[PDB]
Write an enzyme that holds these catalytic residues in place. Sequence first.
Site, PDB file in Angstrom:
ATOM      1  N   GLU A  39       8.961   3.145   4.995  1.00 24.51           N
ATOM      2  CA  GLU A  39       8.251   3.046   3.744  1.00 24.51           C
ATOM      3  C   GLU A  39       7.800   1.625   3.456  1.00 24.51           C
ATOM      4  O   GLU A  39       6.835   1.419   2.752  1.00 24.51           O
ATOM      5  CB  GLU A  39       9.051   3.604   2.617  1.00 24.51           C
ATOM      6  CG  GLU A  39       8.425   3.305   1.269  1.00 24.51           C
ATOM      7  CD  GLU A  39       9.247   3.931   0.234  1.00 24.51           C
ATOM      8  OE1 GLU A  39       9.485   5.139   0.253  1.00 24.51           O
ATOM      9  OE2 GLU A  39       9.735   3.057  -0.633  1.00 24.51           O
ATOM     10  N   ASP A  68       5.025   8.763  -3.750  1.00 25.65           N
ATOM     11  CA  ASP A  68       5.197   7.397  -3.335  1.00 25.65           C
ATOM     12  C   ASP A  68       4.060   6.524  -3.711  1.00 25.65           C
ATOM     13  O   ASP A  68       4.284   5.433  -4.187  1.00 25.65           O
ATOM     14  CB  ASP A  68       5.686   7.192  -1.884  1.00 25.65           C
ATOM     15  CG  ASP A  68       6.755   8.179  -1.450  1.00 25.65           C
ATOM     16  OD1 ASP A  68       7.153   9.085  -2.158  1.00 25.65           O
ATOM     17  OD2 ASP A  68       7.202   7.987  -0.226  1.00 25.65           O
ATOM     18  N   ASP A  84       2.728  10.587  -0.097  1.00 28.18           N
ATOM     19  CA  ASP A  84       4.175  10.672  -0.036  1.00 28.18           C
ATOM     20  C   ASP A  84       4.692  10.390   1.384  1.00 28.18           C
ATOM     21  O   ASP A  84       4.316  11.066   2.318  1.00 28.18           O
ATOM     22  CB  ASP A  84       4.551  12.137  -0.374  1.00 28.18           C
ATOM     23  CG  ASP A  84       5.480  12.340  -1.555  1.00 28.18           C
ATOM     24  OD1 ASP A  84       5.762  11.404  -2.313  1.00 28.18           O
ATOM     25  OD2 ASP A  84       5.967  13.584  -1.716  1.00 28.18           O
ATOM     26  N   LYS A  86       7.203  10.752   4.355  1.00 30.09           N
ATOM     27  CA  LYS A  86       8.296  11.614   4.831  1.00 30.09           C
ATOM     28  C   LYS A  86       8.749  11.152   6.218  1.00 30.09           C
ATOM     29  O   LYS A  86       7.934  10.711   7.072  1.00 30.09           O
ATOM     30  CB  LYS A  86       7.960  13.084   4.889  1.00 30.09           C
ATOM     31  CG  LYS A  86       7.642  13.689   3.548  1.00 30.09           C
ATOM     32  CD  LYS A  86       8.597  13.223   2.471  1.00 30.09           C
ATOM     33  CE  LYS A  86       8.562  14.104   1.238  1.00 30.09           C
ATOM     34  NZ  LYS A  86       9.484  13.659   0.182  1.00 30.09           N
TER      35      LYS A  86
END
Length: 213
Positions: A39, A68, A84, A86
Amino acid sequence: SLRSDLINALYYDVCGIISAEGKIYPLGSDTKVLSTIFELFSRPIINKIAEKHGYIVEEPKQQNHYPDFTLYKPSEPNKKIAIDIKTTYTNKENEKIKFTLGGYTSFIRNNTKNIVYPFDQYIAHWIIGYVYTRTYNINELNEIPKPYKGVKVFLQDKWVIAGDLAGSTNIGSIHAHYKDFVEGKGIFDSEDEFLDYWRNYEYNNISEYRNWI
DNA sequence: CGAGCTCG
DNA sequence: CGAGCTCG
């Protein structure tokens, strides 16, 4: 496209934790610290490719909120792009994977619960997936044995990747191979169908659902 | 929520 | 061997 530009960019080796003194500390196999890393690695990319498309990038002021990254053109607000991140891992190589894609009771149902911006203002839901296979000085970087190898990436629509089973109140993705994710070889016949299916999840699967109509 | 373990 | 339990 903005999608295209992003994808292209995505198409991720950490060495360790560094100390101000220059000292480097190899990390480990904690399946949790890693998901945080994929991330850190992302924020910049998404940021850079967005800005080069006149899009402001938003992040949640509080943990545990979707998604996110919120993307949009200041000019137009009812057309947001939610990204987002993952993550997942494999024990062997080229196995079938599976992710967890959210809660099927939050915004998906009430429009406001847990989402940064009202779900209705979001036109797309991308999922950047990352798959992986489970002291030192600036010079030795090539000596720090990594904590995982052979990472993979994929940008994709959440509803495409979405499954019919449930995580273990979270949604589970399909349970496929890395190829099926990229291509978009899903289960739902549509976003509408995805929504509906997941909005009325207490039918026990997509087949039992169609019949249910 | 994610992960190691179990027992059928 | 793997779905699920149970512990972190």
